[PDB]
Design a protein around this ligand. Sequence first.
Ligand SMILES: OC[C@@]1(O)OC[C@@H](O)[C@@H](O)[C@@H]1O
Ligand SMILES: OC[C@@]1(O)OC[C@@H](O)[C@@H](O)[C@@H]1O
Ligand SMILES: OC[C@H]1O[C@](O)(CO)[C@@H](O)[C@@H]1O
Ligand SMILES: OC[C@H]1O[C@](O)(CO)[C@@H](O)[C@@H]1O
Ligand SMILES: *[C@@H]1O[C@H](CO)[C@@H](O)[C@H](O)[C@H]1O
Ligand SMILES: *[C@@H]1O[C@H](CO)[C@@H](O)[C@H](O)[C@H]1O
Ligand SMILES: [Ca+2]
Ligand SMILES: [Ca+2]
Ligand SMILES: [Mg+2]
Ligand SMILES: [Mg+2]
Ligand SMILES: [Mg+2]
Ligand SMILES: [Mg+2]
Ligand SMILES: [Mg+2]
Lengths: 570, 570
Amino acid sequence: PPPTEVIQLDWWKNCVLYQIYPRSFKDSDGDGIGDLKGIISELKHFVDAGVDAIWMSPIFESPMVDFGYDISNFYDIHYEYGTMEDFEELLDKAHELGLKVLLDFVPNHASNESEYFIKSEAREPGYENFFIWADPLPNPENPGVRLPPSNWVSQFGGSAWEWSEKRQQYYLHQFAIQQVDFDFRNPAVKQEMFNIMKFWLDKGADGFRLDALPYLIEADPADHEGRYPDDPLSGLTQFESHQLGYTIPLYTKDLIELYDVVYEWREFLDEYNKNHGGDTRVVFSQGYANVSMTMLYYGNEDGAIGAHFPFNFDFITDLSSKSNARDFVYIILRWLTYMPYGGIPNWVFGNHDNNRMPTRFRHDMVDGLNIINMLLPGVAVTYQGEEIGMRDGYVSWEDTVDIEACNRGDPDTYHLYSRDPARTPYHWDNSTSAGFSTSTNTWLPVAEDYQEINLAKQKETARSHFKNYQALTKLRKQATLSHGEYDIRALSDRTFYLVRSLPTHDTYVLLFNVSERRDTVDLGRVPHLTLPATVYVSSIHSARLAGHEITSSQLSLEAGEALVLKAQPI
Amino acid sequence: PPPTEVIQLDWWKNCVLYQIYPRSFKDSDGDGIGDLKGIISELKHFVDAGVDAIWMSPIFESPMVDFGYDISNFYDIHYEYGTMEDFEELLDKAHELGLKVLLDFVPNHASNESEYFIKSEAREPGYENFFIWADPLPNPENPGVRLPPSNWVSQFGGSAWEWSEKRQQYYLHQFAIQQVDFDFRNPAVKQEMFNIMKFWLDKGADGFRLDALPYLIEADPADHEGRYPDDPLSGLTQFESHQLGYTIPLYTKDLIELYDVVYEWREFLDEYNKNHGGDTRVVFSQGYANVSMTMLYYGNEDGAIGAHFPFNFDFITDLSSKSNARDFVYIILRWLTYMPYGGIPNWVFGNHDNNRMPTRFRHDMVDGLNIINMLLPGVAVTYQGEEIGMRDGYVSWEDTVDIEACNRGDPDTYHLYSRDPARTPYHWDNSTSAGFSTSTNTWLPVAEDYQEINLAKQKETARSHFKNYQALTKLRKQATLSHGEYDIRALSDRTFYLVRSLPTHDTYVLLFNVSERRDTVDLGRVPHLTLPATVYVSSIHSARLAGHEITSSQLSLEAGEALVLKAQPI
Ligand SMILES: OC[C@@]1(O)OC[C@@H](O)[C@@H](O)[C@@H]1O
Ligand SMILES: OC[C@@]1(O)OC[C@@H](O)[C@@H](O)[C@@H]1O
Ligand SMILES: OC[C@H]1O[C@](O)(CO)[C@@H](O)[C@@H]1O
Ligand SMILES: OC[C@H]1O[C@](O)(CO)[C@@H](O)[C@@H]1O
Ligand SMILES: *[C@@H]1O[C@H](CO)[C@@H](O)[C@H](O)[C@H]1O
Ligand SMILES: *[C@@H]1O[C@H](CO)[C@@H](O)[C@H](O)[C@H]1O
Ligand SMILES: [Ca+2]
Ligand SMILES: [Ca+2]
Ligand SMILES: [Mg+2]
Ligand SMILES: [Mg+2]
Ligand SMILES: [Mg+2]
Ligand SMILES: [Mg+2]
Ligand SMILES: [Mg+2]
């Protein structure tokens, strides 16, 4: 029978979404800092790679305490990265190449250098209640020793409460001292968030990543006899009272009221899209939470609609080099089992907040992991460098600039916390500073392996991570990946299959030996696979090349080996 | 295309396995205690129910501290239950009726009234090292102040170490003070377990349940400078030093050496089956552990073969009335994802150690839960009472006899620990004591609801839990249930499907609304379902009767409603 026709999906339902970390992508001006003119000079890379949409880590005005996540002006561009004119040029050139562009910001908090905070601290009319301000806890026993409002612990270590001498109250910071939590029960705060989003959509952004949403709302002291309630204690002996893990965040994380804010954002965005037309503008939410709390970002049982999707961190939080094939299958099944009917799945293997994909897994698993990302239903998310298999770079204590590591760590522990190894500059080629900069003095050190692992090398060599990346993003154009069913099971502790199938269309099969040992499997166990089948993609050290035919039902896979097979339609 | 011939499976691969609790099954002699003549009198019940194999909770000589799991003679029958001749009669009549009969015992420990312990405490030759005996922990601060060997906590509260005045040493008890842990590094103890198994296999037993296996082996002092190492502390404020949960059982539970004992037991059983022929004799292992530690009971990487299966307690540990249809699917997929290839899956919904199935879930979910048990691949495990939807019985503090409750509990807390509510006498009919006994003086109180919930009532009335149970055990003779594939997914937060399919054989489909609300689903989402299809079984509260034709692809299911549909072969 002739192949069935399929209805085209809206762009966000099956895009390849690439995360740029602008500070480390491309330095155009020799200061060792990535910049917007740098990104503009390499927009063609996303077309070459088969990326549909780029998001940037923050580029708004920021003192850079948390490299952009401490925003002092939500309406202008950080000078080290360029100007508003450069951003507008980036949007125009990206759109001309057919790319979508999303911006990133963290609604939860503003820099203490923001006009909001300066004015709030001054109790300026309209701003007095813009942030969470509290009096000290009455000390009737030592009237003279000042007590914080509650025992709340910051994500970045120490008390979540910072005394203001000027205002003679504490302000809340779930993150850095310099990152002040907005009061999301203040209508003026909610209106300012719509104002920011409308400003950037009007400039032409295609949507937003909205960061750190579990932390929006904290217990209302009206419900606790006018005090901020203590979070319950963990009782874990490895944590002292200034260490993250000392408290259970009952009153400070994943409060149900946060979701009302997200549903209100979605209603705003839906109105905006109705009144402007063109490509749908979207919101993709970030939060690390349990399955229940994460799925609530999609919407709820009462018909609320939230983010276009919450990001799926399962490959970061629940899989690693310790995982066997059964773990891989059981964790892949979690998002697919719990995600609401009609929701769009997404898959995230890395970001600027976690160690790089091949460092969390193994170097010989890069191709298999990128195949899982591209062959699962829904949206593939790629973190800068995954398309060439970048590894964590070495960063000394002396070179560490991550506030999270400076705050929580010391020269012996800092590696437990630092995100800097996943932020080292991108490897374009084997030139000075891996082609990232004409300068040797980069804001973070260039990883030692850049002569071995760089894009130019992988475009010249017959087989490479990047060429496999290109073959996979191209495969996503096939109806079997955009509209096909899925079946996933383990064949052994070492190997699993993923089958995409769709009547009258080619079948595609992943086989992946995720173990450190060779494995032999019976392909007769794989549903919808008739032999002979053809190798479409293989891992760079596979004995099988693309175009190789699989004729035998007995297949030996090397440690880390992955194959994509193209088989006849069902 | 005429139905394919399937190869008949060995009996233990797809049996319906029924756990009898002899003390609460049937009292023949009016002492309010269930007994072997009582079981003999009702063996036809298993044939009527479509049960293939019965296991009895322990019937060996026991002081009854733990109602038979404290065994004082592993080679003879507890007097209250009957004689060795009653047991030989039971085995004879059961085998005549085509039933398999398994015995239960707990290798970990013997009664302190056993000859083993009395001789071991007396340091008789050969017995000295039968149990774990330890010196007090040396006390350099004040020599001769008596300290226990370690901080280890018993499962039934207090220290796992009991001082013997007679022997001037402590003995290990992971369970009650009266349950003494064997030394499983002693070859004479291992030889004694082979002797015990050989004795009962020689009498005609079809196999064993071996209880409490995670506790067999504890840390060897020879690996900790000649002391028993402390278990790590949990840090949890709700647990004092005498309370289960105070410690993390690093050195006392799930030691990798316990699995070598299991593999040796299978090698012995394999040799016995080979030398005796007839029907395979089996071992089913018990242990509550994580999925890692649970699957090693089947066997290991190196090719060790263990129990025919370990019991799957997921419907007790990981699902309850709090669970939605997505939880059901995600937990059902756990065993099927993790079990080794060739493994036989099994499904346990209750036992004498946990609250009854309708009490853990809801009264209106009984049929749906019995359908899952019978329609998933592998072995269905039934606990005495589940075939009629028995609810937990009320048992006051005054009537409580469970050592776990007496030791861990007080008049206000005892309900958190007691297993007595799941051990109340079986509801045969609406006669005195529900037909369990001619006496009103029963060893536990008969539940208040026996007039409403009894077997005789359910065999008379047109629709019942028992008639559904019978319809389900009959359905397991169909090739689709013994050899069929499975597919399982959630349609909503409320409803899931399970499809058993097998080309040329009929398709069977469970649809189950596990929620408290009506749900409407689209049957066109269910694979291998062509309409019309026939209701084969329905929940007793369903508007649909068996024989009812589903024609519409839109289906509204009431809270708790489950249907089994019979549909055309694929
Ligand atoms: O608009 C609904 C609501 O729940 O949204 C989150 C907070 O702004 C709450 O004060 C507010 O009532
Ligand atoms: O037979 C192997 C072994 O591991 O079995 C379990 C224990 O009896 C151990 O002492 C013994 O070495
Ligand atoms: O460590 C960085 C922290 O900030 C976040 O982005 C907050 O959502 C998370 O990655 C983590 O809690
Ligand atoms: O509550 C009883 C205890 O004994 C066991 O049967 C041992 O495996 C478990 O049910 C529990 O740990
Ligand atoms: C989300 O927000 C936190 C706090 O501002 C930042 O540190 C992360 O990098 C960002 O992804
Ligand atoms: C398994 O073993 C324990 C300890 O003897 C007992 O209490 C349980 O009832 C049994 O299943
Ligand atoms: Ca907040
Ligand atoms: Ca033991
Ligand atoms: Mg620059
Ligand atoms: Mg971290
Ligand atoms: Mg009796
Ligand atoms: Mg219990
Ligand atoms: Mg299928």
